[PDB]
Enzyme design. Structure first.
Site, short mmCIF file in Angstrom:
data_model
loop_
_atom_site.label_atom_id
_atom_site.label_comp_id
_atom_site.label_asym_id
_atom_site.label_seq_id
_atom_site.Cartn_x
_atom_site.Cartn_y
_atom_site.Cartn_z
N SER B 81 0.83 -1.12 -0.04
CA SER B 81 0.04 0.07 -0.03
C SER B 81 1.03 1.21 -0.06
CB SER B 81 -1.11 -0.06 1.13
OG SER B 81 -2.16 0.74 0.89
N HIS B 236 -7.55 -6.33 0.42
CA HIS B 236 -6.48 -5.58 0.59
C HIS B 236 -5.49 -6.15 1.52
CE1 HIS B 236 -4.26 -1.73 -0.06
NE2 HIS B 236 -4.20 -1.66 1.18
N1 MXN Z 1 -1.05 2.77 3.26
C1 MXN Z 1 -2.16 2.13 3.60
C2 MXN Z 1 -3.32 1.38 4.32
O1 MXN Z 1 -3.76 0.33 3.50
C3 MXN Z 1 -4.20 2.27 4.42
C4 MXN Z 1 -4.45 2.81 5.84
C5 MXN Z 1 -5.58 3.46 6.21
C6 MXN Z 1 -6.38 3.80 5.35
C7 MXN Z 1 -6.46 3.20 4.25
C8 MXN Z 1 -5.66 2.31 3.74
#
Ligand code: MXN
Ligand code: MXN
Ligand code: HBX
EC number: 4.1.2.10
Lengths: 259, 259
Positions: B81, B236
């Site tokens: 991410s 995710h």
């Molecule tokens: N970078 C990262 C994470 O997946 C994330 C953290 C908080 C909100 C959405 C996504």
């Protein structure tokens, strides 16, 4: 149907609320509410242990949780290991908010000797700390003894019956902590009117390599419980190695305190 | 028996090294080496995010991990991410320590626009923040935007294919975080000679409800990869929902960069 309970879960030294991650959903699926307390300087708590100088400071997130319960609500209060000492401090403050104390592979203090008595007894006979790191921190409350577990010590004495995944998770989450033994030895003895008046039961693991049977029988002898439960094949981290069997012990405790 | 590799694993914002607790023993039990980095103000790190004002301070533990590797060792560096941004910064510093970059359900920046570009684009596009709490902190050099996930948004958008235990574990460990958008807008473009020179592949979850399929195609069009891998049924948090299929992808990538 049968009525449910609110369990408040209290973790051990050097760990945090995360150890309950398997047990919490089993309890909720059965219809209970669950509060996994995070003690000072534990888990993701923002304080380092060097900033928590007393066992009262350490226990404060437990006192607060009990303080904020609505009137006449009573909990099932579970303390793990050093959490036994925490739950006894809590019981001496809010006895009427506790339906039963659950000592789980825990220290079980009495109302006759200094509160450090069962810790001091075990420390004398303990055996092998292995790669654990000891250090000191000097405070305005005297000298604090800190420890940080070594990974070989964890593997052999606390996690030996746990899946490898949980061992790897514990390596990524455990922190420097304290048993507060100096502070505990100076404290006013636990009272008979408070802690001494609360119902209590003991849940033990058969393969706990930290708290041997031997020693548990001695603590129970000094200070009786209503009932003893046994988890066959559990290591010290019984909520990680045998969560379903821990669930079964906790249901059966729930069923004895319907009234 | 083939050459094994060293995998350096880099978590997302608001999480920590703990996320890798299922994947790490899979990799090690197949012969590989694994270092799961913990970033500043993340997991059990003693700092609050307020004290880390810049994405260079945030990334420093990753940078220290690469600096400490012995002469001529190369790693497979995996970035999840927002970890995609971290692995890019590292690759601009130490390109020759990295066999291949693995952007896992990740922000994949380019060398044309400012480094905040893929983040600003997602932030204009995403409508399902839910109970997520947003705030500002004022630093001596400007506003720092912060976020803390809400539990409903976690369950709907990140964890919806994970076992209920893993969602309970996240609820006990996740913390206030930051995407450092203002700091990354002020930063120099990532370079061609550094980050641009390094091999990269993209690994994507087929049911990612936070980084959608289309956005990925867009990001890969600004900035090409050698190869795209898909994990069917992954959310995710694919190292928690489909760890064995993430293992299969990373062994396939290790087979292509064997040497
Ligand atoms: N970078 C990262 C994470 O997946 C994330 C953290 C908080 C909100 C959405 C996504
Ligand atoms: N309290 C408690 C834990 O079980 C514990 C923690 C560190 C070393 C021994 C035992
Ligand atoms: O030796 C004391 C002690 C205290 C808590 C856990 C394990 C040992």
């Amino acid at each position: 149907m049968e009525r449910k309970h609110h369990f408040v879960l209290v973790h051990n030294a050097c760990h945090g609320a995360w150890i309950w991650y398997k047990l919490k959903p089993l309890l909720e699926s059965a219809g209970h509410r669950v509060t996994a307390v995070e003690l000072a300087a534990s888990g993701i708590d923002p304080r380092p242990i060097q900033a928590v100088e007393t066992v009262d400071e350490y226990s404060k997130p437990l006192i607060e949780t009990l303080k904020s319960l609505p009137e006449n609500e009573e909990v099932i209060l579970v303390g793990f290991s050093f959490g036994g000492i925490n739950i006894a401090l809590a019981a001496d403050i809010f006895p009427a908010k506790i339906k039963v104390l659950v000592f789980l592979n825990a220290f079980l203090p009495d109302t006759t000797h200094v509160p450090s008595h069962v810790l001091d007894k075990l420390m004398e006979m303990f055996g092998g700390w292995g790669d654990t790191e000891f250090s000191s921190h000097e405070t305005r409350n005297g000298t604090m003894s800190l420890l940080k577990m070594g990974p070989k010590f964890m593997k052999a004495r606390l996690y030996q019956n746990c899946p490898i995944e949980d061992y790897e998770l514990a390596k990524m989450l455990h922190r420097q902590g304290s048993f507060f033994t100096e502070d505990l030895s100076k404290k006013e003895k636990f009272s008979e009117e408070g802690y001494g008046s609360v119902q209590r039961v003991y849940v033990m693991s058969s393969e706990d390599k930290i708290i041997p049977c031997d020693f548990i029988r001695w603590m129970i002898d000094n200070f009786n419980v209503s009932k003893v439960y046994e988890i066959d094949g559990g290591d010290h981290m019984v909520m990680l190695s045998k969560p379903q069997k821990l669930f079964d012990s906790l249901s059966a405790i729930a069923t004895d305190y319907m009234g």
